[PDB]
Write a protein that binds this ligand. Structure first.
Ligand SMILES: Nc1nc2c(ncn2[C@@H]2O[C@H](COP(=O)(O)OP(=O)(O)NP(=O)(O)O)[C@@H](O)[C@H]2O)c(=O)[nH]1
Ligand SMILES: [Ca+2]
Ligand SMILES: [Ca+2]
Ligand SMILES: [Mg+2]
Ligand SMILES: [Mg+2]
Length: 166
């Protein structure tokens, strides 16, 4: 069956782990344990196709930036996550995209831009700003909440559907 290698990237604390765990395990992780690098796999049906999701949950703490080249080489599609209440995290997206672009020697890498924590009211990144950023990369923008499950399946499934367009 078809296997899709997804890699979840973004700054510390934006909710990469919570998003992934909500998707695979269907619960919300409230506590904050910084990730080094974890792998998750789950067989799922997407648009009638039975497939395997191979998801790499990566480190947002910059001390581990050295590991980025390895996973960027392996991954087929990248979920670029920021938090809507964390401007700096949104600004950090460009540094992730650039490295992906270098490593893949491509600017048609399957990606989805994700604005997570859309359940919180402390918004400093407005939807339209993120929409504009994603437009410049030629990718979708999707808002999520790992807490309420809003948009979680759509984000990852859209990433799959982007890999398929390539
Ligand atoms: N309200 C709310 N809190 C969230 C959401 N996603 C994550 N959080 C909270 O934000 C904190 C950090 O989440 P986490 O998933 O660990 O972030 P991370 O990006 O995986 N961190 P790291 O890069 O260090 O591995 C946790 O306390 C988590 O509960 C969300 O959608 N809504
Ligand atoms: Ca919990
Ligand atoms: Ca692109
Ligand atoms: Mg994490
Ligand atoms: Mg503003």
């Amino acid at each position: 069956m078809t296997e899709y290698k997804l890699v979840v990237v973004g700054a510390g604390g934006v909710g990469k782990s919570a998003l992934t765990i909500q998707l695979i395990q269907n619960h919300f992780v409230d506590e904050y344990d910084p990730t080094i690098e974890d792998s998750y796999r789950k067989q799922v049906v997407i648009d009638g196709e039975t497939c395997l999701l191979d998801i790499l949950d990566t480190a947002g703490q910059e001390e581990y930036s050295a590991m980025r080249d390895q996973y960027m080489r392996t991954g087929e599609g990248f979920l670029c996550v920021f938090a809507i209440n964390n401007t700096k995290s949104f600004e950090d997206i460009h540094q992730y995209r650039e490295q992906i672009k270098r490593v893949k020697d491509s600017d048609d890498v399957p990606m989805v831009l994700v604005g997570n924590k859309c359940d919180l009211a402390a918004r400093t990144v407005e939807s339209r700003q993120a929409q504009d950023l994603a437009r410049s990369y030629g990718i979708p923008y999707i808002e999520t909440s790992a807490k309420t499950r809003q948009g979680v399946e759509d984000a990852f499934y859209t990433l799959v559907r982007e890999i398929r367009q390539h």
